[PDB]
Design a protein around this ligand. Structure first.
Ligand SMILES: [Mg+2]
Ligand SMILES: [Mg+2]
Ligand SMILES: [Mg+2]
Ligand SMILES: [Mg+2]
Ligand SMILES: [Mg+2]
Ligand SMILES: [Mg+2]
Ligand SMILES: [Mg+2]
Ligand SMILES: [Mg+2]
Ligand SMILES: [Mg+2]
Ligand SMILES: [Mg+2]
Ligand SMILES: [Mg+2]
Ligand SMILES: [Mg+2]
Ligand SMILES: [Mg+2]
Ligand SMILES: [Mg+2]
Ligand SMILES: [Mg+2]
Ligand SMILES: [Mg+2]
Ligand SMILES: [Mg+2]
Ligand SMILES: [Mg+2]
Ligand SMILES: [Mg+2]
Ligand SMILES: [Mg+2]
Ligand SMILES: [Mg+2]
Ligand SMILES: [Mg+2]
Ligand SMILES: [Mg+2]
Ligand SMILES: [Mg+2]
Ligand SMILES: [Mg+2]
Ligand SMILES: [Mg+2]
Ligand SMILES: [Mg+2]
Ligand SMILES: [Mg+2]
Ligand SMILES: [Mg+2]
Ligand SMILES: [Mg+2]
Ligand SMILES: [Mg+2]
Ligand SMILES: [Mg+2]
Ligand SMILES: [Mg+2]
Ligand SMILES: [Mg+2]
Ligand SMILES: [Mg+2]
Ligand SMILES: [Mg+2]
Ligand SMILES: [Mg+2]
Ligand SMILES: [Mg+2]
Ligand SMILES: [Mg+2]
Ligand SMILES: [Mg+2]
Ligand SMILES: [Mg+2]
Ligand SMILES: [Mg+2]
Ligand SMILES: [Mg+2]
Ligand SMILES: [Mg+2]
Ligand SMILES: [Mg+2]
Ligand SMILES: [Mg+2]
Ligand SMILES: [Mg+2]
Ligand SMILES: [Mg+2]
Ligand SMILES: [Mg+2]
Ligand SMILES: [Mg+2]
Ligand SMILES: [Mg+2]
Ligand SMILES: [Mg+2]
Ligand SMILES: [Mg+2]
Ligand SMILES: [Mg+2]
Ligand SMILES: [Mg+2]
Ligand SMILES: [Mg+2]
Ligand SMILES: [Mg+2]
Ligand SMILES: [Mg+2]
Ligand SMILES: [Mg+2]
Ligand SMILES: [Mg+2]
Ligand SMILES: [Mg+2]
Ligand SMILES: [Mg+2]
Ligand SMILES: [Mg+2]
Ligand SMILES: [Mg+2]
Ligand SMILES: [Mg+2]
Ligand SMILES: [Mg+2]
Ligand SMILES: [Mg+2]
Ligand SMILES: [Mg+2]
Ligand SMILES: [Mg+2]
Ligand SMILES: [Mg+2]
Ligand SMILES: [Mg+2]
Ligand SMILES: [Mg+2]
Ligand SMILES: [Mg+2]
Ligand SMILES: [Mg+2]
Ligand SMILES: [Mg+2]
Ligand SMILES: [Mg+2]
Ligand SMILES: [Mg+2]
Ligand SMILES: [Mg+2]
Ligand SMILES: [Mg+2]
Ligand SMILES: [Mg+2]
Ligand SMILES: [Mg+2]
Ligand SMILES: [Mg+2]
Ligand SMILES: [Mg+2]
Ligand SMILES: [Mg+2]
Ligand SMILES: [Mg+2]
Ligand SMILES: [Mg+2]
Ligand SMILES: [Mg+2]
Ligand SMILES: [Mg+2]
Ligand SMILES: [Mg+2]
Ligand SMILES: [Mg+2]
Ligand SMILES: [Mg+2]
Ligand SMILES: [Mg+2]
Ligand SMILES: [Mg+2]
Ligand SMILES: [Mg+2]
Ligand SMILES: [Mg+2]
Ligand SMILES: [Mg+2]
Length: 247
RNA sequence: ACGGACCAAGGAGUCUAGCAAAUGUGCAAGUGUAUAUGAUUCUUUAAACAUUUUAUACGCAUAAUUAAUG
RNA sequence: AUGCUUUAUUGAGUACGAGCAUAUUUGGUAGGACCCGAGAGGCUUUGAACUAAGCGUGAUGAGAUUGAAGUCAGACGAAAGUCUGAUGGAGGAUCGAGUUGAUACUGACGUGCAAAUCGUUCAUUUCAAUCACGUUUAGGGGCGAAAGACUAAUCGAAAAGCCUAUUAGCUGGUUAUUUUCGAAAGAUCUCUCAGGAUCGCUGGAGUUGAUUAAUAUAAUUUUACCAGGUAGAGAUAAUGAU
RNA sequence: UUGUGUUGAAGCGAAAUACGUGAGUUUUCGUGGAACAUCUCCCUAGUGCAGAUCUUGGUGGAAGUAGCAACUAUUCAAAUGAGAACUUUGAAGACUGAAGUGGAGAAGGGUUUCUUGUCAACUGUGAUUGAACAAGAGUUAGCCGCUCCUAAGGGAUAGCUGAAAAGUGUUUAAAGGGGUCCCCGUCUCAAAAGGGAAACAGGUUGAUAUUCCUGUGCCAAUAGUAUUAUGAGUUAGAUGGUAACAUAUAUAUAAAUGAACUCCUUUACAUAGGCUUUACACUCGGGGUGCGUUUUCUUUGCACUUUACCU
RNA sequence: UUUGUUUUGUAGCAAUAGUAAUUCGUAAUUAUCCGAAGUGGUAAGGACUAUCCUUGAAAAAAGGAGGGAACGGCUUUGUGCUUUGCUACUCUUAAUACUUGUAUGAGCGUACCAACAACCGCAUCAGGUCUCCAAGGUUAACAGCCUCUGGUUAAAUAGAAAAAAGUAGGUAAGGGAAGUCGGCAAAAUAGAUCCGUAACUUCGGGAAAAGGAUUGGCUCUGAGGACAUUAAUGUUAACUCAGAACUGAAACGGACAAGGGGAAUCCGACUGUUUAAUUAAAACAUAGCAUUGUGAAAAGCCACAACUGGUAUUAACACAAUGUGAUUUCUGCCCAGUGCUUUGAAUGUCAACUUGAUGAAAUUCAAUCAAGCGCAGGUAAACGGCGGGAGUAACUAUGACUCUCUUAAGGUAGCCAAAUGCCUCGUCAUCUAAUUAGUGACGCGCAUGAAUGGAUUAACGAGAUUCCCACUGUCCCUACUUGCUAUCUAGCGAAACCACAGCCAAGGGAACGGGCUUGGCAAAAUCAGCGGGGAAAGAAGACCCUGUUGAGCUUUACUCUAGUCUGGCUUUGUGAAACGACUUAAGAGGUGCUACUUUUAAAGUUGUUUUACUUAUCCAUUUAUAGGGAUGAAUUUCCCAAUAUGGAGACAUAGCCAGGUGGGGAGUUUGACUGGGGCGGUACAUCUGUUAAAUAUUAACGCAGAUGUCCAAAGACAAGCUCAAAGAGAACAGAAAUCUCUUGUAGACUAAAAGGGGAAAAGCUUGUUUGAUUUCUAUUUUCAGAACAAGUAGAAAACGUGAAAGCGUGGCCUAUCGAUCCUUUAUAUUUGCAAAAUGACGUAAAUUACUUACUACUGUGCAUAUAGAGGUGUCUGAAAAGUUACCACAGGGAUAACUGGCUUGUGGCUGCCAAGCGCUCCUAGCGACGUAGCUUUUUGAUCCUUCGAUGUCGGCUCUUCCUAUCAUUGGGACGCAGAAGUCUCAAAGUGUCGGAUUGUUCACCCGCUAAUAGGGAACGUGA
């Protein structure tokens, strides 16, 4: 009868992100001559907090090379950086925490973050607080590098892509029990409108496949297939397996 | 069992198409002057009057029967 | 082959034509169709001055209670550590007036002051708090701490105008006089059982006949003849009981 | 076809020694004031009402009945007037009790405001009252606001999609600009509580006031040329202090050279808790002035004793 | 740059203004305007501390700095750079004069209300509606009560009287919940100081636990600071706190203000939220726990008609989709069913396209690695599920043990008459006097149980229950009082409703009358109450049934559809390899130049597969900013070679076509009969007998039954023969084996129900057969005298049997079955395919070809006439699943759920007879086996009245009637000594109670009593 809650989220009316006090987008530096041939170095002016995101941001200043002036960058800060530090970005920069290097000049076992899955991309992969990847293989003729991602997947990347040495700061923040409904009210207040959640078994049949009944049950197998239409994919999607995991 | 406090005005088997039966009228193996045209028709007349100077417009009837050549 | 024959069978066929036109009435059909009456379906538009949720900018919560971590001082002890007094001001802490609401009297009123009010009594006040303007989301759609709730006294699908005088085997109504004739509530078929078609029962029109105490005719008798297994009877005649 | 009418038509009220089984027809008197029939035979229709919770309009019994009950409360005397429980004046008794029927604003209303007059209807009892009715009046700004800036957002331009109507909004624009020949970089609307040049006190009208009057101040803008005065610098740019820093007082502290380019600061910011300072408020005692009580008491009870912006 | 003091000034504004006074005149003058402190209400600033998985706008506009471009002036040769002097020149503010378009200050708002009558609510409506200011006393207090400044004394009315009854209040002797479903309502408590506080517990609480004492006024004592002369003297405050004496009708938070407490059970962890106008909860949320998908602009989830978007200013400590619901302790077994998911040319089926074979061609046929299903696995914190019967231990009883059916697995740890147990008011204990209630135990549990979460649980709750203390007008049992109404006056002034109307009893009547019949009776007009009746009013019953009337929701109902997955063709270019296809003479052959299958340097062209390239196409980044190799400030070396960049790349994407999946979505449907409907059944198409009343016809969900088949013989004809059974006889042989005789009217048989028929046959056995065949008519049954269907009597052919007359058109007779449209095979010297031809230039002539005359028989495919067949059992013949406790409409008393009416089976009461009981004795008192009635206080049966409506259980209050008499009054009898009782007569005058449990009517206990009888009045009684 009626359009479901999870279908309405795509209209983007009251489900758009809350971003009034956010500070800007976190990108690497634009790929240019210096990083391809040597390196360039910038100065850390501040570490600041971003309302929606858990990891801190470093505010870093480089010096213009084509012209007289200065320029600004926003970069996810790795654990250990400090105000007044000089970091160096380029193909020949020394290996140290906070420098930005191509992944093909790093030995095996190096912990990295803020990685590009394509060259010149300005960084996409390892970004949430407390996360890192591992260099796990260098190809015989260069041109390819193999890494291990936080979820445990393995990937091969172009060997000229860039990343930061070290781990993302402010890690270990899911070890504190939230303990109050108001704390979770304040958490999602600055993210998006997704809290609280009514469960489908407590609605009427018009609004949900689980709704209705004289006893609050599903009455249906709760694992649905990958091909089901939008108003019907609602329980466990394409589940290979259910129940407690034992290994 | 339902409608009705009282009074006045209004208020409901009609019109058109197509078929049949009954009855009145005209002509009769025929009958009906279609659309038009004509006129010393033109307040009335948007009515009425006329029919192309051994005579093939059309309808119904005058002949039936068969899927059909017939 | 211009097919033939008495045969049988069929036609809304033939055996010296009756039609065409035009008044009116009646019947059945289509149309608004004797008059008034739905619950619905569709097309295009108008509303978030109420209320729901998000967002921007601002404003607001008398008074009192309780007493976490940190700090100072004193006592004990070989160390580790323990005990006593003060200080301090935490917490979706506690009473409570405003504010925001609505538990009970199943009180008053119920032709109200009022299409939700009045009185007393209740719940809530540092937080998931409460208000005001501005702004976003529009109808099979939105919004919902979820009651099928709310979306301008309208929501298990808003409001305005059209398609539209939609359809109804079902309720209600249907307008002057006298005179003459006068019913059925059985039967067959039916997605038929509150309906219909068809036969029966009724009225009107018109011929052919009889008007010759006749013939046709008769919900009646008489004379001649025919068919029957019900009332009674039987159980020793058959069957079955006793 | 052939008739009635100002010497009185239709219609209406009451009737008749009248006719008909009946629907009806005909006639008298009164009112009325202008048209009305045809039955000689035909044509024609939106042609005959007791009902449909029928439509529109008017009117009853109920009935001088139900009722005119929240908000503590009224009394004496006078004026006016045809007429005063509810108009005005004086004297009493009381209420609101600063979280006020006290003052000032927004949304909304639109002349309800003021003076004069004044009662047909309204002001659910009266009414001489009134936000009712009639005639004429009344709203004054460089300093209070809008107007300017940007916000959540709206409308647009290029392009793309669609039969269009419309949807979306740099998704490869030779755009928009500003700086004097260069660089930067879409347009526009959206806050009378956010941001933001600048004003105070006294007086004044029937009705306006940080707007009018008086006096004293502030802010912003003010072409070119020439003269005259105010100060400063050089015989292409001043000094003091160890330092933190300081210095132009002319009517008026106005002048301490500085291009392209570049970097910062103000505007500019949450909540809770106690400590502290200063203004406004409140109160106690002296002095002056006026008033009140006074059979008894009382060096006594109350009022006033003020000071803005700007330098 | 020095001293007390030169002395002035509210520092200027400034007294010239404001306020309070005293003056003199019909605008006039004077005097004051100045000395020291306290309290802490309101606002703002300052320096600080702490909190956040929460870190709390921007722009117009203004300012500061770095750096060092340019530059002493007036005329002085020339072509902006070349020549001579003075060492006034450069800024800055103000005023003036002239040239200049006319060289200060735009435009719009401004009255009044802001609710008390100016706004919205139909109004001059007790409602709603945003912001700022805020005095004195009491006090913790901006609370409550009283007051000053300012405001008012007004409300759609007044006067009198004062009874019932109402509404808002106040008291009550003795008892203290006995009232009631229920302590509903009301009382009792309460401020502050000092003492004292349990179980349990997540150690934080519970907690104001529970409890005890004090409190006025007056007169005193003690404690707590600051400052200046020097330990000593002197001045000087604010408010609290602790003690003592005295005093009063023993009173003192004196008015106001202000918790009732305790022992346990159930649910939910907690603060929070919800159905605006009948539900505030145990419902929703929540922290915590667990499961699932996804490494990216070719990804997960979602929006759009397309083009494009949301999450995303994102990146696994993330985003998205679900369950359960704090802590503690736990979370058992099942993958057979249904879902979801993994592998693939070994593998079955499953499209378009393509490729071959054949043919004149249209067609026809065959082959080929798509996805999906099938085949083989995983998964229960996916949907869900988790057994019976017997025997057995030295008194009984029980069953550790055993046997046997049996499942995918057989309910584990726990828990229980639980918000879950029918029987049920379960058994035992406890609580009371008395317990359908409460608590603790028991467990073969109709039908308990593990994130559908199981068992607990401190704290918390306007949540659901039981008991105790305090308290009381809830009650015994009511009385007295105040305001405001009602009442009577002057003024003003409606509405609902209304066929006509309004006294009764019985009768009949649509079975409950105001009106009708027969009786009782019946005398103006008027005031205040009241709730028996007018089956009173409101309003086309919402319950129930009907309608070929709807709508919301569900699904493995009937048809479809968005989206997803999969294959083909086009977009679409340049090369190169490797294997497949259709051809060479070979290969063994089997066959009568020849016919078919078979190992290899191909006759030459086409196909899936792999790889390479860049310009089509797609993506990303930037201001399209250097061609490859070796926490100051920065602006005016060498080697390698002459499409912005990078990544993919003819693959994605996109357009047309094809297949799978698809309640996410759309449209629709979901028979009838029926002692209401539903369930059951078929009485829905047929047949035998009976009801059926001696022609024929005739109903019910009447009675006893049968049909949807069967048979090359069980059909046709002819001949011969005679059956069931019984008796007596015959080696094994008997009750039953084979054989002979005698009797035998059918007692046998004849496919199947039942009825009728049948003896040289209709039965049995033999012989020959296919009339169970082709065509047509007159007609009978049901009936409209319509179709099918099943029969009867015949005619035109060709046959069978029999010697012959004859008989045969299925079964000895009565049942055994099917339209239009469509399809399919048969028949024909019958026809068509819209200008014509197709056997065939066949036969005979003729020539110099457009020659002539003759002929039953003429391409593929399709159509058409006539005859059978494929089926409609709802059988005169639609392609069709559920639910509504969210509901809508048109109707029905044609039809259910009350009262009333007829009946009285069942329920209740009363009779008659005498077997027997009563030691003995039929009848004191009873009464078996039988049998006659009465009543309408039970429950049925029926469907008469009411569906545009007669309020549906019980209790409380109040009146009246009946007798089928419990007590009280007079009597009779006994199995009657007295006492106490039992049976019975006249008799309705007077009575027929207080309580515990339950919503109860009904029950069952504790009591008293004289007795604690039974009933009716629309199941008496809801304006
Ligand atoms: Mg629900
Ligand atoms: Mg659904
Ligand atoms: Mg549940
Ligand atoms: Mg189930
Ligand atoms: Mg009716
Ligand atoms: Mg009526
Ligand atoms: Mg005629
Ligand atoms: Mg014709
Ligand atoms: Mg009509
Ligand atoms: Mg429809
Ligand atoms: Mg609004
Ligand atoms: Mg809002
Ligand atoms: Mg709290
Ligand atoms: Mg009430
Ligand atoms: Mg209330
Ligand atoms: Mg519901
Ligand atoms: Mg209609
Ligand atoms: Mg008659
Ligand atoms: Mg006339
Ligand atoms: Mg009419
Ligand atoms: Mg009329
Ligand atoms: Mg009338
Ligand atoms: Mg009336
Ligand atoms: Mg009255
Ligand atoms: Mg008045
Ligand atoms: Mg007062
Ligand atoms: Mg008061
Ligand atoms: Mg107050
Ligand atoms: Mg006025
Ligand atoms: Mg006036
Ligand atoms: Mg009046
Ligand atoms: Mg006026
Ligand atoms: Mg102005
Ligand atoms: Mg201003
Ligand atoms: Mg914006
Ligand atoms: Mg603007
Ligand atoms: Mg402002
Ligand atoms: Mg004024
Ligand atoms: Mg003013
Ligand atoms: Mg001063
Ligand atoms: Mg004003
Ligand atoms: Mg209005
Ligand atoms: Mg009113
Ligand atoms: Mg009002
Ligand atoms: Mg009273
Ligand atoms: Mg007293
Ligand atoms: Mg008492
Ligand atoms: Mg009791
Ligand atoms: Mg009782
Ligand atoms: Mg109860
Ligand atoms: Mg109470
Ligand atoms: Mg306790
Ligand atoms: Mg709760
Ligand atoms: Mg729990
Ligand atoms: Mg709560
Ligand atoms: Mg409600
Ligand atoms: Mg409520
Ligand atoms: Mg819950
Ligand atoms: Mg959760
Ligand atoms: Mg399985
Ligand atoms: Mg396959
Ligand atoms: Mg067990
Ligand atoms: Mg149990
Ligand atoms: Mg129990
Ligand atoms: Mg489990
Ligand atoms: Mg269960
Ligand atoms: Mg009165
Ligand atoms: Mg009577
Ligand atoms: Mg009556
Ligand atoms: Mg009478
Ligand atoms: Mg009554
Ligand atoms: Mg009805
Ligand atoms: Mg109904
Ligand atoms: Mg429907
Ligand atoms: Mg559906
Ligand atoms: Mg039926
Ligand atoms: Mg008979
Ligand atoms: Mg016989
Ligand atoms: Mg024979
Ligand atoms: Mg036979
Ligand atoms: Mg049928
Ligand atoms: Mg039939
Ligand atoms: Mg349905
Ligand atoms: Mg009836
Ligand atoms: Mg009986
Ligand atoms: Mg009625
Ligand atoms: Mg009644
Ligand atoms: Mg009624
Ligand atoms: Mg008796
Ligand atoms: Mg006696
Ligand atoms: Mg006696
Ligand atoms: Mg009753
Ligand atoms: Mg009775
Ligand atoms: Mg009632
Ligand atoms: Mg009752
Ligand atoms: Mg009553």
């Amino acid at each position: 009868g009626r359009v479901i809650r999870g279908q309405r989220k795509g209209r983007g009316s009251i489900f758009k992100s809350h971003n009034h006090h956010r500070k800007g987008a976190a990108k690497l530096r634009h790929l240019d001559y210096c990083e391809k041939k040597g390196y360039i170095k910038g100065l850390v002016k501040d570490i600041i907090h971003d309302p929606g995101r858990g990891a801190p941001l470093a505010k870093v200043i480089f010096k213009r090379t084509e012209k007289y002036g200065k320029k600004e960058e926003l970069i996810i800060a790795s654990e250990g950086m400090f105000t007044g530090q000089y970091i160096s970005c380029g193909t020949k920069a020394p290996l140290s925490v906070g420098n930005i290097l191509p992944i093909g000049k790093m030995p095996e076992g190096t912990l990295i973050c803020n990685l590009e899955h394509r060259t010149g991309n300005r960084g996409t992969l390892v970004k949430a607080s407390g996360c890192y990847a591992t260099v796990v293989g260098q190809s015989e003729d260069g041109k390819k590098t193999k890494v291990r991602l936080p979820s445990g997947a393995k990937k091969t990347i172009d060997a000229k892509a860039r990343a930061m040495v070290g781990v993302v700061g402010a890690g270990g923040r899911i070890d504190k029990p939230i303990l109050k409904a108001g704390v979770a009210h304040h958490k999602y207040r600055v993210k998006r409108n997704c809290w609280p959640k009514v469960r489908g078994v407590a609605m009427n049949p018009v609004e949900h496949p689980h709704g209705g009944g004289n006893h609050q049950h599903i009455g249906h197998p709760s694992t649905v297939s990958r091909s089901a239409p939008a108003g019907q994919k609602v329980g466990l999607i394409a589940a290979r397996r259910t129940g407690l995991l034992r290994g």
